[PDB]
Amino acid sequence: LENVYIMADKQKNGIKANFKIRHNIEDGGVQLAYHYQQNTPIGDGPVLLPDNHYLSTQSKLSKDPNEKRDHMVLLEFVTAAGITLSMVSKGEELFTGVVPILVELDGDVNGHKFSVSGEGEGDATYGKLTLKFICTTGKLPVPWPTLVTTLVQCFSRYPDHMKQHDFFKSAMPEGYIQERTIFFKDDGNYKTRAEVKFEGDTLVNRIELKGIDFKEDGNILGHKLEYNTRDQLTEEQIAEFKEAFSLFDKDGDGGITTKQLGTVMRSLGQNPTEAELQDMINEVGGTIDFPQFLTMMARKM
């Protein structure tokens, strides 16, 4: 669970953000990566600038065992948080259902050119992303976990009382421009610029990344970082919670009320004491998200 902290940028009519990514190093350790991010509308119409809040993000990286190319299967779930106790941009309509995503990245790290390409789907009301990524130029010269952040936060899931702080969807369909610098401790740094906008019926994220100053035998060019985490539920486990969870999602809004938790729990065969229910609620916590629910669950195994 990585946390993206977000602020408005009133002069630039957008937002910016900062966060830290713990990458597990091969046989012990954690390489850090420091993100600084700035987003600006592509279009002229007005956009929600938010209050200080943050996004709570869950990643899951797998491999397709029929793909002989170098690739990443990626599952992801995000929820806005912080702000306690709204509005709905006109753009938040485009996101109500299931929207297909396409991604395209060009990069030179340390003179090593390469191109990722990725397709999938987003389901904003669940905060869900599934996407598969191919490195179209050959062998990816940097580790895939290093490209996850670079590789669409408009698919985040803002609680009802926070729908008004969602800059990302408000900017749509015109889109926004995302720029980051990522600083790998005791090693080089990525520098990126992406346009994220609607093209036809598809959220399209075109990125150009530039990495300099990398130690050739470091952790990135050296490929010394873990791919999985295995601190993690499975695909077929998540799919069940999704299917149970959404059964009891009576409006399909992506939420379940809290009383409801136990019913959902029982439909999985599990049986929580009302002592056990009141805990889960408060640690994460009337409305519950799927990502939240997912984290609630995550703990208890």
Describe the protein.
The protein is mainly beta and 301 residues long. It has two domains: 232 residues, Green fluorescent protein (Green Fluorescent Protein), CATH 2.40.155; 69 residues, EF-hand (Recoverin, domain 1, Orthogonal Bundle). Helix content is 15%, strand content 39%. An eleven-stranded mixed β-barrel has the order 1-2-3-9-10-11-6-7-8-5-4. A hairpin with a 4-residue loop joins strand 7 and strand 8. Helix 4 packs across helix 5. The longest helix has 13 residues. It is globular, with a radius of gyration of 19 Å. 36% of the residues are buried. Belongs to the GFP family. This is Green fluorescent protein. It comes from Aequorea victoria. Monomer. Keywords: Chromophore, Luminescence, Photoprotein.
